[PDB]
Design an enzyme around this catalytic site. Structure first.
Site, PDB file in Angstrom:
ATOM      1  N   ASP A   1      -8.388  -2.584   8.468  1.00  0.00           N
ATOM      2  CA  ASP A   1      -8.439  -1.262   9.093  1.00  0.00           C
ATOM      3  C   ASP A   1      -8.986  -0.194   8.152  1.00  0.00           C
ATOM      4  OD1 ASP A   1      -8.106   0.539  11.171  1.00  0.00           O
ATOM      5  OD2 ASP A   1      -6.017   0.971  10.644  1.00  0.00           O
TER       6      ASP A   1
ATOM      7  N   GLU B   1      -0.388  -8.188   4.516  1.00  0.00           N
ATOM      8  CA  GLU B   1      -0.878  -9.493   4.102  1.00  0.00           C
ATOM      9  C   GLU B   1      -1.835  -9.334   2.927  1.00  0.00           C
ATOM     10  OE1 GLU B   1      -3.508 -13.224   6.016  1.00  0.00           O
ATOM     11  OE2 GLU B   1      -3.002 -11.444   7.197  1.00  0.00           O
ATOM     12  N   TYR B   2      -1.687 -10.203   1.932  1.00  0.00           N
ATOM     13  CA  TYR B   2      -2.529 -10.173   0.743  1.00  0.00           C
ATOM     14  C   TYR B   2      -3.754 -11.056   0.951  1.00  0.00           C
ATOM     15  CZ  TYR B   2      -4.018 -11.618  -3.985  1.00  0.00           C
ATOM     16  OH  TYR B   2      -4.749 -11.936  -5.107  1.00  0.00           O
ATOM     17  N   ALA B   3      -4.937 -10.479   0.736  1.00  0.00           N
ATOM     18  CA  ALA B   3      -6.203 -11.190   0.880  1.00  0.00           C
ATOM     19  C   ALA B   3      -6.766 -11.468  -0.506  1.00  0.00           C
ATOM     20  CB  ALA B   3      -7.196 -10.375   1.712  1.00  0.00           C
TER      21      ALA B   3
ATOM     22  N   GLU C   1     -17.838  -4.404   4.872  1.00  0.00           N
ATOM     23  CA  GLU C   1     -16.845  -3.652   4.112  1.00  0.00           C
ATOM     24  C   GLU C   1     -15.470  -3.715   4.764  1.00  0.00           C
ATOM     25  OE1 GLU C   1     -19.636  -0.884   5.421  1.00  0.00           O
ATOM     26  OE2 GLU C   1     -20.447  -2.864   4.931  1.00  0.00           O
TER      27      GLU C   1
ATOM     28  N   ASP D   1     -16.941  -0.120  14.157  1.00  0.00           N
ATOM     29  CA  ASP D   1     -17.864  -1.200  13.833  1.00  0.00           C
ATOM     30  C   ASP D   1     -17.228  -2.183  12.860  1.00  0.00           C
ATOM     31  OD1 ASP D   1     -19.838   0.047  15.398  1.00  0.00           O
ATOM     32  OD2 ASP D   1     -20.559   1.219  13.685  1.00  0.00           O
TER      33      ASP D   1
ATOM     34  N   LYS E   1       0.844  -1.188   0.000  1.00  0.00           N
ATOM     35  CA  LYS E   1       0.000   0.000   0.000  1.00  0.00           C
ATOM     36  C   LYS E   1       0.881   1.241   0.000  1.00  0.00           C
ATOM     37  CE  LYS E   1      -3.767   2.287   2.497  1.00  0.00           C
ATOM     38  NZ  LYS E   1      -4.711   2.192   3.644  1.00  0.00           N
TER      39      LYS E   1
HETATM   40  N1  LIG Z   1      -4.214  -6.570   1.826  1.00  0.00           N
HETATM   41  C1  LIG Z   1      -5.112  -6.429   0.849  1.00  0.00           C
HETATM   42  N2  LIG Z   1      -5.385  -7.495   0.062  1.00  0.00           N
HETATM   43  C2  LIG Z   1      -6.283  -7.358  -0.918  1.00  0.00           C
HETATM   44  N3  LIG Z   1      -6.991  -6.278  -1.261  1.00  0.00           N
HETATM   45  C3  LIG Z   1      -6.700  -5.240  -0.466  1.00  0.00           C
HETATM   46  C4  LIG Z   1      -5.799  -5.227   0.584  1.00  0.00           C
HETATM   47  N4  LIG Z   1      -5.758  -3.978   1.183  1.00  0.00           N
HETATM   48  C5  LIG Z   1      -6.623  -3.275   0.492  1.00  0.00           C
HETATM   49  N5  LIG Z   1      -7.229  -3.973  -0.519  1.00  0.00           N
HETATM   50  C6  LIG Z   1      -8.230  -3.473  -1.456  1.00  0.00           C
HETATM   51  O1  LIG Z   1      -7.915  -2.127  -1.767  1.00  0.00           O
HETATM   52  C7  LIG Z   1      -8.976  -1.251  -1.330  1.00  0.00           C
HETATM   53  C8  LIG Z   1      -8.390   0.032  -0.799  1.00  0.00           C
HETATM   54  O2  LIG Z   1      -7.669  -0.253   0.414  1.00  0.00           O
HETATM   55  P1  LIG Z   1      -7.251   0.902   1.417  1.00  0.00           P
HETATM   56  O3  LIG Z   1      -6.457   1.894   0.657  1.00  0.00           O
HETATM   57  O4  LIG Z   1      -6.542   0.319   2.644  1.00  0.00           O
HETATM   58  O5  LIG Z   1      -8.639   1.524   1.889  1.00  0.00           O
HETATM   59  P2  LIG Z   1      -8.776   2.521   3.083  1.00  0.00           P
HETATM   60  O6  LIG Z   1      -7.700   2.284   4.096  1.00  0.00           O
HETATM   61  O7  LIG Z   1     -10.157   2.274   3.750  1.00  0.00           O
HETATM   62  N6  LIG Z   1      -8.760   4.115   2.551  1.00  0.00           N
HETATM   63  P3  LIG Z   1      -7.207   4.731   2.262  1.00  0.00           P
HETATM   64  O8  LIG Z   1      -6.202   4.278   3.387  1.00  0.00           O
HETATM   65  O9  LIG Z   1      -7.282   6.225   2.235  1.00  0.00           O
HETATM   66  O10 LIG Z   1      -6.694   4.208   0.861  1.00  0.00           O
HETATM   67  C9  LIG Z   1      -9.779  -2.073  -0.328  1.00  0.00           C
HETATM   68  O11 LIG Z   1     -11.132  -1.637  -0.258  1.00  0.00           O
HETATM   69  C10 LIG Z   1      -9.659  -3.486  -0.901  1.00  0.00           C
HETATM   70  O12 LIG Z   1     -10.595  -3.707  -1.951  1.00  0.00           O
END
Ligand SMILES: Nc1ncnc2c1ncn2[C@@H]1O[C@H](COP(=O)(O)OP(=O)(O)NP(=O)(O)O)[C@@H](O)[C@H]1O
Ligand SMILES: Nc1ncnc2c1ncn2[C@@H]1O[C@H](COP(=O)(O)OP(=O)(O)NP(=O)(O)O)[C@@H](O)[C@H]1O
Ligand SMILES: OC[C@H]1O[C@H](O[C@H]2O[C@H](CO)[C@@H](O)[C@H](O)[C@H]2O)[C@H](O)[C@@H](O)[C@@H]1O
Ligand SMILES: OC[C@H]1O[C@H](O[C@H]2O[C@H](CO)[C@@H](O)[C@H](O)[C@H]2O)[C@H](O)[C@@H](O)[C@@H]1O
Lengths: 279, 279
Positions: free
Chosen positions: B167, B104-106, B153, B149, B55
């Site tokens: 998170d 971790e990759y989901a 999602e 909560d 990320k």
């Molecule tokens: N570890 C992961 N494995 C697979 N898909 C993921 C993973 N992390 C995030 N995603 C996907 O990527 C999207 C964006 O993640 P994320 O950026 O962490 O959202 P957020 O934390 O709620 N908002 P922000 O931090 O501002 O980007 C998620 O809604 C998932 O669909």
């Protein structure tokens, strides 16, 4: 022994005068503000020459967002509140593409803007605001109105500088997925607190007294976790210029035990309030 | 009678090893998702060929929004949680303009997406999810983690289809004016409920069991006021296809009296849970 009564047994489908307002009743002036769904203009009723505010919403945008039922409920609730410190909603009307709210005009802007300009308020302006808000809160509770936090952004100022509680932010947290999250997962003990008795609003009033006199809320922090901890442990301090009477009122309103917070009538009777309030 | 002690009296200014991660340690694949601040990519550590998710956040966007301290706190908290049903944050690093989270990759997406596709879950998938969430909630409470909560999602799915608490939504409600409003005016009794004991999370778990089995939350309504009333009065009903065991668990979790809600270990022991859960 017969069970064929002389009573209805048919399936029931539970899913079922004078001069009205018209857009031509109003002269239109300058825009007063704009939100996500609303467009507020200075307006004047033609027959009486009475100055008001006309808020214009578009039916297409309301239905596309799925907040039309929430707008309807806000109009029904607000138009029944009549208090000098609650922004009056005289009525509504609609045409082909637009919904119109006929509102009391608040000439002096929001308390939020005024707090930005003055940085902080003196004891007389603050104590007078608190008297007006305590009166409004008493009316709101007697009508059992479900409401949100009273913050400076939700407060308008009348012509004589008096507080007007406004219904801003109604679309936020309204069920449409909503961007800010709804209440669907919250238990009763986390939502009943406001409306049940005065104690939640009394805490929020104490925060507002502090923010008026100081310029910032007492529990602000850089993270949501630390703000959580400061609130729950009531960790806040007073700057030097906050007087003893103000300290006494704020500290009693910000009691962790809700039963130890003074009632709204006790707030109006507080010696610091009566000494500095013009109301 | 001398008050010049052998002790400090000076003013104190309270405002004061191995191989590190590098961007070159990772091969980059397709984007997995994107939020407001984050950009998530499929990645692979070069030496071990281990698949993960990387990320990427931009320091300029974080500081321009004033949420950098919140991101920092989330990284510090999440990287210390180690549970099979909590999305693992292995570590972090940063360069000139970007912050990197090694996650971790989901592989199987969110429960929210899966609920959209199936409309509703069967009793075996639901009961297994609840076992995993109850275990995760027990770990979260033992670590005293301040959390929000748990909704579909916020739930990712591992390779074997197991739940992963994510998170998501950390920037929302974080002190920056924030669009969704902060906690500054909320009293302790409205915020302490989660974290103090299990009862708030147990209610939210009951809502989640219902939403899994039915496809919609039990208290949804067209206005925020009506949702408020349905929650506080516990006004919800079951469709025909919800079995007696499921009804028993949901009704006990959705008790108005928090002390009447069964503990997390009682949930794992419920006969409907043990009969249908593969975990
Ligand atoms: N570890 C992961 N494995 C697979 N898909 C993921 C993973 N992390 C995030 N995603 C996907 O990527 C999207 C964006 O993640 P994320 O950026 O962490 O959202 P957020 O934390 O709620 N908002 P922000 O931090 O501002 O980007 C998620 O809604 C998932 O669909
Ligand atoms: N009666 C009024 N008198 C003076 N100014 C007003 C009045 N009503 C609204 N305003 C101003 O116009 C702005 C927008 O109002 P409004 O549209 O009601 O906001 P909102 O309800 O919170 N969001 P939305 O309903 O989607 O537009 C306010 O923030 C005020 O600055
Ligand atoms: O003296 C400072 C206050 O000025 C305003 O209130 C005064 O002006 C009003 C209009 O005549 C009167 O109704 C009021 O009684 C006066 O005190 C202002 O509204 C206050 O916020 C200030 O404290
Ligand atoms: O039978 C429906 C379930 O299928 C998945 O779970 C199965 O597949 C997993 C991978 O082998 C196993 O770990 C698990 O024990 C199996 O039950 C799915 O994860 C479940 O949600 C379904 O209920």
């Amino acid at each position: 022994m017969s069970y064929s009564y002389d009573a209805p047994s048919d399936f029931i489908n539970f899913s079922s005068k004078k001069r009205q307002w018209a857009l031509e009743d109003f002269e239109i002036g300058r825009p007063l503000g704009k939100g996500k769904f609303g467009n507020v203009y200075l307006a004047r009723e033609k027959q009486s020459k009475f100055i008001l505010a006309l808020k214009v919403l578009f039916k297409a945008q309301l239905e596309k967002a799925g907040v039309e039922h929430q707008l309807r409920r806000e109009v029904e609730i607000q138009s029944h509140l009549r208090h000098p410190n609650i922004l009056r909603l005289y009525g509504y009307f609609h045409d082909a593409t637009r919904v119109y709210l006929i509102l009391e005009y608040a000439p002096l802007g929001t308390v939020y803007r005024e707090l930005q300009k003055l940085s902080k308020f003196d004891e007389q302006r603050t104590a007078t605001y608190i008297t007006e808000l305590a009166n409004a809160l008493s009316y709101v509770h007697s009508k059992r109105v479900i409401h949100r936090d009273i913050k400076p952004e939700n407060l308008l100022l009348g012509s004589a500088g008096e507080l007007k509680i406004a219904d801003f932010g109604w679309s936020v947290h309204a069920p449409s997925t909503t961007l800010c999250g709804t209440l669907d997962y919250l238990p009763p003990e986390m939502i009943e607190g406001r409306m049940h008795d005065e104690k939640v609003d009394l805490w929020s009033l104490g925060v507002l007294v502090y923010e008026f006199l100081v310029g910032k809320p007492p529990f602000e922090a850089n993270t949501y976790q630390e703000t959580y901890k400061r609130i729950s442990r009531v960790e806040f301090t007073f700057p030097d210029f906050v007087t003893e009477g103000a300290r006494d009122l704020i500290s009693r309103l910000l009691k962790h035990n809700p039963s130890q917070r003074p009632m709204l009538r006790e707030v109006l009777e507080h010696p610091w309030i009566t000494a500095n309030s013009s109301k």
